[PDB]
Amino acid sequence: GSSGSSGSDDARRLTVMSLQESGLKVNQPASFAIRLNGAKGKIDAKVHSPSGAVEECHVSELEPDKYAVRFIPHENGVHTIDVKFNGSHVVGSPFKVRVGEPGQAG
Numbered sequence: 186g187s188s189g190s191s192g193s194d195d196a197r198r199l200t201v202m203s204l205q206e207s208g209l210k211v212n213q214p215a216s217f218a219i220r221l222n223g224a225k226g227k228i229d230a231k232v233h234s235p236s237g238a239v240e241e242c243h244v245s246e247l248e249p250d251k252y253a254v255r256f257i258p259h260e261n262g263v264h265t266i267d268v269k270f271n272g273s274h275v276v277g278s279p280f281k282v283r284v285g286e287p288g289q290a291g
Contacts, residue, residue: 194271195224206282209258216255229269
């Protein structure tokens with residue numbers, strides 16, 4: 186019709202911010218923000234694992250142009266972020282992030 190069911194969507198119109206890829210910490214809370222260039226609809230953020238499990242990340246709406254997504258990066262190698270918007274993977278998705286950092290604490 187005219188006002189209701191819509192065809193295409195605005196998924197590619199999304200930019201990731203404060204996203205850790207080479208500075209993640211195991212057994213530690215890690216959240217990131219998602220910039221919106223004026224794309225409305227639905228937001229989906231889940232964490233994938235090579236073990237065959239799919240966890241759900243906490244998604245809270247703070248700003249009409251910005252969002253927060255917390256997740257616990259716990260894997261045995263590399264993680265794979267999956268972002269969906271109105272049924273479509275945004276640009277540069279999924280995203281890759283290597284957990285770990287060059288250093289020793291203790």
